[PDB]
């Protein structure tokens, strides 16, 4: 199968659709990769990037793919950066027949917005997100998109329940950097309206792309016919993985994304 996958392309820094296409491709899927902003660098310790605008080139894009008769399987949206963007995305999904849409609402961390995001963002964000079978906010995101004021844990019973009101029925809202004792995870609401939790022990320090790959690993996993549960414990398994492995590269530059070796092997033996 194919898919579409939709975030920022940075030509240094081995996140966001540099990673998601090594994974997608060894799972198996035909990935249609589109970068919604193409960047010398990621944002995080190389200085101001170089940046191109590619508010014009995305309708091109779409209005191409729909004469030439494009149908994609499935869908993966990340980081996306604009309100006319978002708004694009939003109308091409609506016109395809997904089986399976999965959609990261990058928004903020630490209680506050990104930098140039405001909430004209939101709201677009709010908009894109209502076709979804999955979407993947962090807390701070999943705040700002109910918009109740930030909390570093959030109730649970309340914000999961307040998210799902904005998804289409049968869909799911996973808050994935929910912190459980010296646990690291993913909650979310079963089919009886219960609060579940998956997560793996926390590892020290911070690393840059571990979303975007819990992204693809989930999407990637799902688009294969895995429920969510397992999803969910795969994905988290993966990642700490990821990380671990990461560790041990003992890298003197701290910039560079999750290492994806591990993972992909493990992806390997998955298909047999
Ligand atoms: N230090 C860590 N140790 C273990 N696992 C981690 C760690 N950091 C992240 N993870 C894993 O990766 C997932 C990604 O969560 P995270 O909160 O980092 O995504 P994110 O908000 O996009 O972060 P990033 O800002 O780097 O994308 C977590 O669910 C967990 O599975
Ligand atoms: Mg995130």
């Not at 708004?87 to 999904?93: A, G, N, V």
């Not at 709201?123 to 570093?152: F, H, K, S």
Request: net charge negative; with cysteine.
């Amino acid at each position: 199968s194919t898919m579409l996958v939709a975030e920022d392309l940075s030509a240094v820094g081995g996140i966001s659709l540099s990673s998601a296409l090594p994974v997608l491709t060894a799972m198996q899927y035909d990935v249609a990769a589109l970068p919604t902003s193409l960047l010398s660098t990621h944002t995080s310790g190389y200085g101001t990037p170089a940046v191109v605008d590619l508010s014009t080139w995305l309708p091109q894009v779409f209005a191409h793919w729909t004469r030439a008769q494009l149908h994609f399987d499935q869908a993966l949206i990340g980081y996306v950066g604009s309100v006319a963007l978002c708004q694009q995305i939003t109308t091409y999904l609506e016109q395809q027949t997904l089986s399976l849409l999965v959609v990261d609402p990058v928004l903020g961390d630490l209680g506050q917005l990104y930098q140039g995001f405001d909430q004209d963002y939101v709201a677009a964000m709010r908009q894109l997100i209502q076709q979804a079978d999955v979407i993947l906010p962090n807390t701070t995101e999943a705040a700002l998109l109910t918009g109740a004021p930030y909390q570093v844990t959030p109730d649970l019973e309340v914000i999961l329940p307040a998210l799902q009101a904005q998804l289409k029925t049968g869909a799911h809202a996973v808050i994935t950097d929910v912190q459980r004792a010296d646990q690291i995870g993913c909650a979310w609401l079963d089919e009886a309206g219960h609060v579940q939790y998956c997560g793996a022990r926390r590892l020290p320090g911070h690393y840059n792309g571990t979303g975007d790959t819990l992204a693809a690993v989930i999407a990637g996993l799902l688009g294969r016919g895995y429920p969510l549960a397992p999803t969910l414990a795969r994905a988290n398994q993966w990642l700490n993985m990821a990380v671990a492995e990461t560790i041990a590269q003992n890298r003197t530059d701290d910039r560079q994304g999750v290492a994806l070796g591990d993972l992909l092997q493990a992806i390997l033996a998955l298909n047999e």
